Amino acid sequence: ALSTQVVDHYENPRNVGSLDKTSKNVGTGLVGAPACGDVMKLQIQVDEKGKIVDARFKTFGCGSAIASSSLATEWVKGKTVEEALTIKNTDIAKELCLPPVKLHCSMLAEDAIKAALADYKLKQEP
Amino acid sequence: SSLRPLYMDVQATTPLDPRVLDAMLPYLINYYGNPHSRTHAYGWESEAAMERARQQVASLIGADPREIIFTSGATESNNIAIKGVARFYRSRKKHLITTQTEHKCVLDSCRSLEAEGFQVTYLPVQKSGIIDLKELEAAIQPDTSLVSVMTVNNEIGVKQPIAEIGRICSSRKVYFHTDAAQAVGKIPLDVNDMKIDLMSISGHKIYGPKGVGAIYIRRRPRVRVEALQSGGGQERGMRSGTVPTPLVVGLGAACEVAQQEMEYDHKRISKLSERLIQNIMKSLPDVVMNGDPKHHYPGCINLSFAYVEGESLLMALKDVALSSGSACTSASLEPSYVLRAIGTDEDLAHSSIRFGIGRFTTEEEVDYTVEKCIQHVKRLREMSPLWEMVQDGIDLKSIKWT
Amino acid sequence: TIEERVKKIIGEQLGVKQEEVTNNASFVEDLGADSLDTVELVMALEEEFDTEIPDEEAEKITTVQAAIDYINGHQ
Amino acid sequence: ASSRAQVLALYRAMLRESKRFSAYNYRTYAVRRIRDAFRENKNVKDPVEIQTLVNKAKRDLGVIRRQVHIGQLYSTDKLIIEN
C-alpha cells in the first residue's frame, strides 16, 4: 500500500545536492552498490566547533531508500559529530514505519551517516 | 475519495470486457445450475452454455472443441501440460526442455519434476529474448518427452518462433506445449499451422474473468496426459471438479470477442506503442528497450531508465498503474530472471519498467504517461549519485563498491 | 466565442478550415460530410450547447446557418 | 423496413448510450469502436450481410444499455486525467 511518510521525501524533497568533497570540514559517505539497487551519497558540513551545520544527499534506490537517506540527512543537522553517531537504523525505520522487507534501507542510511563521519574524522588528524 | 490512477498494467491482468460481463450475468442470477446435473433443465441449460463456451475457445485457436479442457487459470494449465505429460511417459521418457524466461509456473513445475528424478534443460535465450532454434534442435534427446516454450513473454513481450518450434518437435515426435496466456486473442494462433500439441490459456489476460483458463490437448495425433486433480472424471477425466459455468461462459465470450477484435486491437495498440516508445526515447537519454522490437507484441513494453531505480520511478509516477523488474516490487521476491537471462547488467535490471497498452487504453493516457515519465526520470536522475558521477565523467564500471 | 461557436464545431467535426465554414454551406454538398459525420455533428452541437435536438429537428439542420439558427432559438 | 434508417438510428442510439458509461475506459472505447466500425462497414453492398451487421449492432446496443446501467449502480471515482 501507499506509505505517506516515505513518499513525502520524494514529493517534498529536502537537502538534495552536493557539498565540496575537498573541504576539510566536509565528510562524504558513499555506500551500497548499483548492482544491489541502492547507492546512498551523504555529505555533512561541520563547523569549527564540531557541530554539523549542513548536509546533502543523493540516492539511487527505492522510495524507502530515498526516505531513509533523506531522513538521515535532515537528522544529522544540528548534531555534534559525536551525537550524530547516536542515530540508529531502528530510529530511522520507526519514523518511516518501514516494513521488515525494507529495513535494509534504514541500515544502509545508518552506514552512510557513519561513512560520512569517518571521512570527516580522517580529514581532521592534522 | 481521490482521483484514480491510469491503468497501464494489462500484462498483470485486464478489466472485463462489458460484453463478457454481460454474457456471464445470466449465469450469476437465474441459470445457476451445475453443468454436471444431468436430470433437469437447470443442468441442461448450464451444460449447453459450457459446451457453447468450449466451441468459442476452440474456434479462436483452430481446435476441435473436444480438445478444450477448462481449468482455473493458465497456472493450472501449465501444471497439467508439464507434470501430466512428464508423468504419463515416465516409463520411457525422463527429459524435458523449456527456456530460462518462462513464467514461474512452468519453471517451478519443471523444478518439481527434477526433484522427481526428471532431467530438464533450461535453454538460454539470446540478448533479443528469442531462443536459438538450432540450440533447441541439438538439445532434443531420445528420452525427451516435452518441449515447452511460451508464445509471448509476460515481462518483455517478445514472441518465440512457435511455428518453427512445432516443426522441430513434430519431426522428432516430441510433444510441444506453449504457454499462450499473453498471446491468445492478441496475435494469430492456429494449433495445426503451428504444430502445437498442448496450449495454456488464461481468461483474465484477455478481458475475461479471473479464476478460469483452459488447456488445449491435441487429440490427433493423440497426446496423452496423466490427470493431476482427482475426482469424478469431469472434463473427460482430465480436470475433475465442478466446471464453473459463469466463468467458462465468460472465457468463451472473451475468446469470441478477441477473435472479432484482434486485428483492430493490434493496429491500434501498435500505433500507441510506437508513440509511447518514440516519445520517451526522443526526450530522455540512456533509455533501452528490453527485447527485440522485430519479434515483439507491442502491448508489452519493457524499458530501462539508466541511473534511476525502478520502484522509485513507479512511486514517482503516482497516478499511473505500472510494474517493474526491481526485486522489491515483483512479489516482495527476487530480481528479474528474465532481464538477467537476456544479459541485462544487474544495475540496469533494477532500472526497468513495464508499460502495458490494451484494448481500452487511450492516446491521452499514453501521452500523460509519457509526459510524467520524462519529468520524473529527469527528477530522479537529479537525485541520483550515479547520474551525478557520470555527468562528471566518471566510469561507473571502475568503482570499488561496498 | 459568439454563438457562432457553431462554426468552430462544424470545422472541427468535418476537418475544415474555419474559413470555408460559411453561413451558406451545406455539410454534404459543400463540406464533404457523409451521413455518419452528420449524426456525429448534430451530437457535437447537442453536447457543446447543452441542448437536446430531436430527430425531426436534426433532419432540418443541413447547413451552417441552419445550425446557427437552431442554437440561437433554443438558448 | 429501411436498412439506411435502421442504420443511422442505431448509430445515433449507440453513440448516445455509450456516452453514458460512467467508466472512462469503457466510455471512450465504446464511442471510438462504434465510430470505426460503422465507418469500416460503410461500403458493404450485400443486403444480407448488411442485415447481419444491423442485427449485431442491435444486440450490442442491448449490451451497452445493460452495462451502462450496471456501471452506474457500481460507479467509482474518476481517473486523474478526467480532471
Coordinates of N, CA and C in Angstrom, one line a residue, chain B residues 69-239:
Chain B
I69 N -10.1 -28.3 -22.6 CA -10.3 -28.7 -21.2 C -10.4 -27.5 -20.3
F70 N -11.4 -27.2 -19.6 CA -11.4 -26.0 -18.8 C -10.6 -26.2 -17.5
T71 N -10.0 -25.1 -17.0 CA -9.1 -25.1 -15.8 C -9.4 -23.8 -15.0
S72 N -8.7 -23.6 -13.9 CA -8.8 -22.4 -13.1 C -7.9 -21.3 -13.5
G73 N -7.0 -21.5 -14.5 CA -6.1 -20.4 -14.9 C -5.0 -21.1 -15.8
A74 N -4.2 -20.2 -16.3 CA -3.0 -20.8 -17.1 C -2.0 -21.5 -16.1
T75 N -2.0 -21.1 -14.8 CA -1.1 -21.7 -13.9 C -1.5 -23.2 -13.8
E76 N -2.8 -23.5 -13.6 CA -3.2 -24.9 -13.6 C -2.9 -25.5 -15.0
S77 N -3.2 -24.9 -16.0 CA -3.0 -25.5 -17.4 C -1.5 -25.8 -17.5
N78 N -0.6 -24.9 -17.2 CA 0.8 -25.2 -17.3 C 1.2 -26.4 -16.4
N79 N 0.6 -26.5 -15.3 CA 0.9 -27.6 -14.4 C 0.5 -28.9 -15.0
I80 N -0.7 -28.9 -15.6 CA -1.3 -30.1 -16.3 C -0.4 -30.5 -17.5
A81 N 0.0 -29.6 -18.3 CA 0.7 -29.9 -19.5 C 2.1 -30.4 -19.1
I82 N 2.8 -29.8 -18.2 CA 4.2 -30.2 -17.9 C 4.2 -31.4 -17.0
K83 N 3.5 -31.4 -15.9 CA 3.5 -32.6 -15.0 C 2.7 -33.8 -15.6
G84 N 1.7 -33.5 -16.3 CA 0.8 -34.5 -16.9 C 1.5 -35.3 -18.0
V85 N 2.2 -34.6 -18.9 CA 2.9 -35.3 -20.0 C 4.1 -36.0 -19.4
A86 N 4.9 -35.4 -18.5 CA 6.1 -36.0 -17.9 C 5.7 -37.3 -17.2
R87 N 4.7 -37.2 -16.4 CA 4.3 -38.4 -15.6 C 3.7 -39.5 -16.4
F88 N 3.1 -39.1 -17.5 CA 2.5 -40.2 -18.3 C 3.5 -41.0 -19.1
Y89 N 4.5 -40.4 -19.7 CA 5.5 -41.1 -20.5 C 6.8 -41.4 -19.6
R90 N 6.7 -41.4 -18.3 CA 7.8 -41.5 -17.4 C 8.5 -42.9 -17.6
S91 N 7.8 -44.0 -18.0 CA 8.4 -45.3 -18.2 C 9.5 -45.2 -19.3
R92 N 9.2 -44.5 -20.3 CA 10.1 -44.4 -21.5 C 10.8 -43.0 -21.6
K93 N 10.3 -42.0 -21.0 CA 10.9 -40.7 -21.2 C 11.2 -39.9 -19.9
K94 N 12.4 -39.3 -19.8 CA 12.6 -38.6 -18.5 C 13.2 -37.2 -18.7
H95 N 13.3 -36.8 -20.0 CA 13.9 -35.5 -20.3 C 12.8 -34.5 -20.7
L96 N 12.8 -33.3 -20.1 CA 12.0 -32.1 -20.8 C 12.8 -30.9 -21.2
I97 N 12.4 -30.1 -22.2 CA 13.2 -28.9 -22.5 C 12.2 -27.7 -22.3
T98 N 12.7 -26.6 -21.7 CA 12.0 -25.4 -21.6 C 13.0 -24.3 -21.8
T99 N 12.6 -23.1 -21.4 CA 13.6 -22.0 -21.6 C 13.7 -21.2 -20.2
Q100 N 14.8 -20.4 -20.2 CA 15.1 -19.6 -18.9 C 14.1 -18.5 -18.7
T101 N 13.3 -18.0 -19.7 CA 12.5 -16.9 -19.5 C 11.0 -17.2 -19.3
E102 N 10.7 -18.5 -19.2 CA 9.3 -18.9 -19.0 C 8.7 -18.3 -17.7
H103 N 7.4 -18.3 -17.7 CA 6.7 -17.9 -16.5 C 7.0 -18.8 -15.3
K104 N 6.8 -18.3 -14.1 CA 7.3 -19.1 -12.9 C 6.6 -20.4 -12.7
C105 N 5.4 -20.5 -13.2 CA 4.7 -21.8 -13.1 C 5.2 -22.9 -14.0
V106 N 5.7 -22.6 -15.2 CA 6.4 -23.5 -16.0 C 7.7 -23.9 -15.3
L107 N 8.5 -22.9 -14.9 CA 9.8 -23.1 -14.3 C 9.7 -24.0 -13.0
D108 N 8.7 -23.6 -12.1 CA 8.6 -24.3 -10.9 C 8.0 -25.7 -11.1
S109 N 7.1 -25.9 -12.1 CA 6.7 -27.3 -12.5 C 7.9 -28.1 -12.9
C110 N 8.7 -27.5 -13.8 CA 10.0 -28.2 -14.1 C 10.9 -28.5 -12.9
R111 N 11.0 -27.5 -12.0 CA 11.8 -27.8 -10.8 C 11.2 -28.9 -10.0
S112 N 9.9 -29.0 -9.8 CA 9.3 -30.1 -9.1 C 9.6 -31.4 -9.8
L113 N 9.6 -31.5 -11.1 CA 9.9 -32.7 -11.8 C 11.4 -33.1 -11.6
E114 N 12.3 -32.2 -11.5 CA 13.7 -32.5 -11.3 C 13.8 -33.3 -9.9
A115 N 13.1 -32.8 -8.9 CA 13.0 -33.5 -7.6 C 12.4 -34.8 -7.7
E116 N 11.6 -35.1 -8.8 CA 11.0 -36.4 -9.0 C 12.0 -37.3 -9.8
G117 N 13.2 -36.9 -10.1 CA 14.1 -37.7 -11.0 C 14.0 -37.4 -12.5
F118 N 13.4 -36.3 -12.9 CA 13.4 -36.0 -14.3 C 14.6 -35.1 -14.6
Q119 N 15.1 -35.1 -15.9 CA 16.1 -34.2 -16.3 C 15.5 -33.1 -17.1
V120 N 15.8 -31.8 -16.8 CA 15.3 -30.7 -17.5 C 16.4 -29.8 -18.1
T121 N 16.3 -29.5 -19.4 CA 17.2 -28.5 -20.0 C 16.5 -27.1 -20.0
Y122 N 17.0 -26.1 -19.3 CA 16.5 -24.8 -19.4 C 17.3 -24.0 -20.4
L123 N 16.8 -23.9 -21.6 CA 17.5 -23.3 -22.7 C 17.8 -21.8 -22.4
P124 N 19.0 -21.3 -22.7 CA 19.2 -19.8 -22.7 C 18.5 -19.2 -23.8
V125 N 18.4 -17.9 -23.7 CA 17.8 -17.1 -24.9 C 18.9 -16.2 -25.3
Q126 N 18.8 -15.6 -26.5 CA 19.7 -14.6 -27.0 C 19.4 -13.3 -26.3
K127 N 20.3 -12.3 -26.5 CA 20.0 -11.0 -25.9 C 18.7 -10.3 -26.4
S128 N 18.2 -10.8 -27.6 CA 16.9 -10.4 -28.1 C 15.8 -11.0 -27.2
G129 N 16.0 -12.0 -26.4 CA 15.0 -12.6 -25.7 C 14.5 -13.9 -26.5
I130 N 15.0 -14.1 -27.7 CA 14.5 -15.2 -28.5 C 15.4 -16.4 -28.4
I131 N 14.8 -17.6 -28.3 CA 15.7 -18.9 -28.2 C 16.4 -19.0 -29.5
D132 N 17.5 -19.8 -29.5 CA 18.2 -20.2 -30.7 C 17.6 -21.6 -31.2
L133 N 16.9 -21.5 -32.3 CA 16.2 -22.7 -32.8 C 17.2 -23.9 -33.0
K134 N 18.4 -23.6 -33.4 CA 19.4 -24.7 -33.6 C 19.8 -25.3 -32.3
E135 N 19.9 -24.4 -31.2 CA 20.2 -25.0 -29.9 C 19.0 -25.8 -29.4
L136 N 17.8 -25.4 -29.6 CA 16.7 -26.3 -29.3 C 16.8 -27.7 -30.0
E137 N 17.1 -27.7 -31.3 CA 17.3 -29.0 -32.0 C 18.3 -29.8 -31.4
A138 N 19.5 -29.3 -31.1 CA 20.6 -30.0 -30.5 C 20.3 -30.6 -29.1
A139 N 19.4 -29.9 -28.4 CA 19.1 -30.4 -27.0 C 18.1 -31.5 -27.0
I140 N 17.4 -31.8 -28.1 CA 16.4 -32.9 -28.0 C 17.1 -34.2 -27.9
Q141 N 16.8 -35.1 -26.9 CA 17.4 -36.4 -26.6 C 16.4 -37.5 -27.0
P142 N 16.8 -38.8 -26.9 CA 15.9 -39.9 -27.3 C 14.8 -40.0 -26.3
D143 N 15.1 -39.7 -25.0 CA 14.0 -39.8 -24.0 C 13.4 -38.5 -23.7
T144 N 13.4 -37.6 -24.7 CA 12.8 -36.2 -24.4 C 11.3 -36.3 -24.6
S145 N 10.5 -36.1 -23.6 CA 9.0 -36.2 -23.7 C 8.4 -34.9 -24.1
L146 N 8.9 -33.7 -23.7 CA 8.2 -32.5 -23.9 C 9.1 -31.3 -24.1
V147 N 8.6 -30.4 -25.0 CA 9.3 -29.1 -25.2 C 8.2 -28.0 -24.8
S148 N 8.5 -27.1 -23.9 CA 7.5 -26.1 -23.5 C 8.2 -24.7 -23.7
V149 N 7.6 -23.9 -24.6 CA 8.1 -22.5 -25.0 C 6.9 -21.6 -25.1
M150 N 7.0 -20.5 -24.3 CA 5.8 -19.6 -24.3 C 5.7 -18.7 -25.6
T151 N 4.5 -18.4 -26.0 CA 4.3 -17.7 -27.2 C 4.7 -16.2 -27.1
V152 N 4.2 -15.5 -26.1 CA 4.6 -14.1 -25.8 C 5.1 -14.0 -24.4
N153 N 6.2 -13.3 -24.2 CA 6.7 -13.1 -22.8 C 5.9 -12.1 -22.0
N154 N 5.6 -12.4 -20.8 CA 4.7 -11.5 -19.9 C 5.5 -10.3 -19.4
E155 N 6.8 -10.4 -19.4 CA 7.6 -9.3 -18.8 C 8.2 -8.4 -20.0
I156 N 8.7 -8.9 -21.1 CA 9.2 -8.1 -22.2 C 8.4 -8.2 -23.5
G157 N 7.4 -9.1 -23.6 CA 6.6 -9.1 -24.7 C 7.2 -9.7 -26.0
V158 N 8.3 -10.3 -25.9 CA 9.0 -10.9 -27.1 C 8.2 -12.2 -27.5
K159 N 8.1 -12.4 -28.8 CA 7.4 -13.6 -29.5 C 8.4 -14.7 -29.8
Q160 N 8.2 -15.9 -29.3 CA 9.1 -17.0 -29.7 C 8.7 -17.6 -31.1
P161 N 9.5 -18.2 -31.9 CA 9.1 -18.8 -33.2 C 8.3 -20.1 -33.0
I162 N 7.1 -19.9 -32.6 CA 6.2 -21.1 -32.2 C 6.1 -22.1 -33.4
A163 N 5.7 -21.6 -34.6 CA 5.6 -22.4 -35.8 C 6.9 -23.2 -36.1
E164 N 8.0 -22.6 -36.0 CA 9.3 -23.2 -36.3 C 9.6 -24.3 -35.2
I165 N 9.3 -24.0 -33.9 CA 9.5 -24.9 -32.8 C 8.6 -26.1 -33.1
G166 N 7.3 -25.9 -33.5 CA 6.4 -27.0 -33.8 C 7.0 -27.9 -34.8
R167 N 7.5 -27.3 -35.9 CA 8.1 -28.1 -37.0 C 9.2 -29.0 -36.4
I168 N 10.1 -28.5 -35.6 CA 11.2 -29.3 -35.0 C 10.6 -30.4 -34.1
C169 N 9.7 -30.1 -33.2 CA 9.1 -31.1 -32.3 C 8.3 -32.2 -33.1
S170 N 7.5 -31.8 -34.0 CA 6.6 -32.7 -34.8 C 7.6 -33.7 -35.5
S171 N 8.6 -33.2 -36.2 CA 9.5 -34.1 -36.9 C 10.3 -35.1 -36.1
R172 N 10.4 -34.8 -34.8 CA 11.1 -35.7 -33.9 C 10.2 -36.4 -32.9
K173 N 8.9 -36.3 -33.2 CA 7.8 -36.9 -32.3 C 8.1 -36.6 -30.8
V174 N 8.2 -35.3 -30.6 CA 8.4 -34.8 -29.2 C 7.1 -33.8 -29.0
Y175 N 6.4 -34.0 -27.9 CA 5.2 -33.1 -27.7 C 5.7 -31.7 -27.5
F176 N 4.9 -30.8 -28.0 CA 5.2 -29.3 -27.9 C 4.1 -28.6 -27.2
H177 N 4.4 -28.0 -26.0 CA 3.5 -27.2 -25.3 C 3.9 -25.7 -25.3
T178 N 2.9 -24.8 -25.5 CA 3.2 -23.4 -25.4 C 2.3 -22.7 -24.5
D179 N 2.8 -22.0 -23.5 CA 2.1 -21.1 -22.6 C 1.7 -19.9 -23.5
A180 N 0.4 -19.8 -23.9 CA -0.1 -18.7 -24.8 C -0.8 -17.7 -24.0
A181 N -0.7 -17.7 -22.7 CA -1.5 -16.8 -21.8 C -1.5 -15.3 -22.3
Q182 N -0.3 -14.9 -22.7 CA -0.2 -13.5 -23.1 C -0.4 -13.3 -24.6
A183 N -0.7 -14.3 -25.4 CA -0.9 -14.2 -26.8 C -2.3 -14.4 -27.3
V184 N -3.0 -15.3 -26.6 CA -4.4 -15.7 -27.0 C -5.2 -14.4 -27.3
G185 N -5.8 -14.3 -28.4 CA -6.7 -13.2 -28.8 C -5.9 -11.9 -29.1
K186 N -4.6 -11.9 -29.2 CA -3.8 -10.7 -29.4 C -3.0 -10.9 -30.7
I187 N -2.5 -12.1 -30.9 CA -1.8 -12.5 -32.2 C -2.5 -13.8 -32.8
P188 N -2.4 -14.0 -34.1 CA -3.0 -15.2 -34.6 C -2.4 -16.5 -34.0
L189 N -3.3 -17.4 -33.7 CA -2.9 -18.8 -33.1 C -3.7 -19.8 -33.9
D190 N -3.0 -20.8 -34.5 CA -3.7 -21.9 -35.1 C -2.9 -23.2 -34.7
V191 N -3.6 -24.1 -34.0 CA -2.8 -25.2 -33.4 C -2.3 -26.1 -34.5
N192 N -3.0 -26.2 -35.7 CA -2.4 -27.0 -36.7 C -1.3 -26.4 -37.5
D193 N -1.5 -25.1 -37.9 CA -0.4 -24.5 -38.7 C 0.9 -24.3 -37.8
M194 N 0.7 -24.2 -36.5 CA 1.9 -24.1 -35.6 C 2.4 -25.4 -35.1
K195 N 1.6 -26.5 -35.4 CA 2.0 -27.8 -34.9 C 2.1 -27.8 -33.4
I196 N 1.1 -27.3 -32.7 CA 1.1 -27.3 -31.2 C 0.4 -28.5 -30.7
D197 N 0.9 -29.2 -29.7 CA 0.3 -30.3 -29.0 C -0.5 -29.9 -27.8
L198 N 0.0 -29.0 -27.0 CA -0.7 -28.5 -25.8 C -0.6 -27.0 -25.7
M199 N -1.6 -26.3 -25.2 CA -1.5 -24.9 -25.1 C -2.3 -24.4 -23.8
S200 N -1.7 -23.5 -23.1 CA -2.3 -22.9 -21.9 C -2.9 -21.5 -22.2
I201 N -4.1 -21.3 -21.6 CA -4.9 -20.1 -21.9 C -5.4 -19.6 -20.5
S202 N -5.3 -18.2 -20.4 CA -5.8 -17.6 -19.1 C -6.9 -16.6 -19.5
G203 N -8.1 -16.7 -18.8 CA -9.2 -15.8 -19.1 C -8.9 -14.3 -18.8
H204 N -8.2 -14.1 -17.7 CA -8.0 -12.7 -17.2 C -6.9 -11.9 -17.9
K205 N -6.2 -12.5 -18.9 CA -5.2 -11.8 -19.7 C -5.9 -11.4 -21.0
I206 N -7.2 -11.8 -21.2 CA -7.9 -11.5 -22.4 C -9.3 -10.9 -22.2
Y207 N -9.4 -10.0 -21.2 CA -10.7 -9.3 -20.9 C -11.8 -10.2 -20.4
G208 N -11.4 -11.4 -19.9 CA -12.3 -12.4 -19.3 C -12.2 -12.4 -17.8
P209 N -13.0 -13.2 -17.1 CA -12.9 -13.2 -15.6 C -11.7 -13.9 -15.1
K210 N -11.3 -13.6 -13.9 CA -10.2 -14.3 -13.2 C -10.7 -15.6 -12.7
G211 N -9.8 -16.5 -12.4 CA -10.2 -17.9 -11.9 C -10.6 -18.9 -13.0
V212 N -10.3 -18.6 -14.2 CA -10.6 -19.5 -15.3 C -9.6 -19.5 -16.4
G213 N -9.4 -20.7 -17.0 CA -8.5 -20.8 -18.1 C -8.8 -22.1 -18.9
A214 N -7.9 -22.5 -19.8 CA -8.2 -23.7 -20.5 C -6.8 -24.3 -20.9
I215 N -6.8 -25.5 -21.3 CA -5.7 -26.2 -21.9 C -6.2 -27.0 -23.1
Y216 N -5.5 -26.7 -24.2 CA -5.8 -27.4 -25.5 C -4.9 -28.7 -25.4
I217 N -5.5 -29.8 -25.6 CA -4.8 -31.1 -25.6 C -5.1 -31.8 -27.0
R218 N -4.2 -31.8 -27.9 CA -4.4 -32.3 -29.2 C -4.9 -33.8 -29.2
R219 N -6.0 -34.0 -30.0 CA -6.5 -35.4 -30.0 C -6.0 -36.2 -31.2
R220 N -5.6 -35.5 -32.3 CA -4.9 -36.3 -33.4 C -3.7 -35.6 -34.0
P221 N -2.5 -36.2 -33.9 CA -2.3 -37.4 -33.2 C -2.5 -37.3 -31.7
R222 N -3.0 -38.3 -31.0 CA -3.4 -38.2 -29.6 C -2.2 -37.9 -28.7
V223 N -2.4 -36.9 -27.9 CA -1.4 -36.6 -26.9 C -2.0 -37.1 -25.5
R224 N -1.2 -37.8 -24.8 CA -1.7 -38.4 -23.5 C -1.2 -37.6 -22.4
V225 N -2.0 -37.4 -21.4 CA -1.6 -36.6 -20.2 C -2.2 -37.3 -19.0
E226 N -1.4 -37.5 -17.9 CA -1.9 -38.0 -16.7 C -2.6 -36.9 -15.9
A227 N -3.9 -37.1 -15.5 CA -4.6 -36.1 -14.8 C -4.0 -35.8 -13.4
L228 N -4.1 -34.5 -13.0 CA -3.5 -34.1 -11.7 C -4.5 -34.0 -10.6
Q229 N -5.7 -33.4 -11.0 CA -6.8 -33.2 -10.0 C -7.7 -34.5 -10.0
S230 N -7.7 -35.2 -8.9 CA -8.5 -36.5 -8.8 C -10.0 -36.1 -8.5
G231 N -10.9 -37.0 -8.8 CA -12.3 -36.7 -8.7 C -13.2 -37.5 -9.6
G232 N -14.4 -37.1 -9.9 CA -15.3 -37.9 -10.6 C -15.2 -37.9 -12.1
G233 N -14.1 -37.4 -12.7 CA -13.9 -37.5 -14.1 C -14.5 -36.4 -15.0
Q234 N -14.9 -35.3 -14.4 CA -15.3 -34.2 -15.3 C -14.2 -33.8 -16.3
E235 N -14.6 -33.1 -17.3 CA -13.7 -32.7 -18.4 C -12.9 -33.9 -18.9
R236 N -13.6 -34.9 -19.3 CA -13.0 -36.2 -20.0 C -12.0 -36.8 -19.1
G237 N -12.1 -36.7 -17.7 CA -11.1 -37.3 -16.8 C -9.9 -36.4 -16.7
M238 N -9.7 -35.5 -17.5 CA -8.5 -34.5 -17.3 C -8.6 -33.4 -16.3
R239 N -9.7 -33.0 -15.8 CA -9.8 -31.9 -14.8 C -11.1 -32.1 -14.0

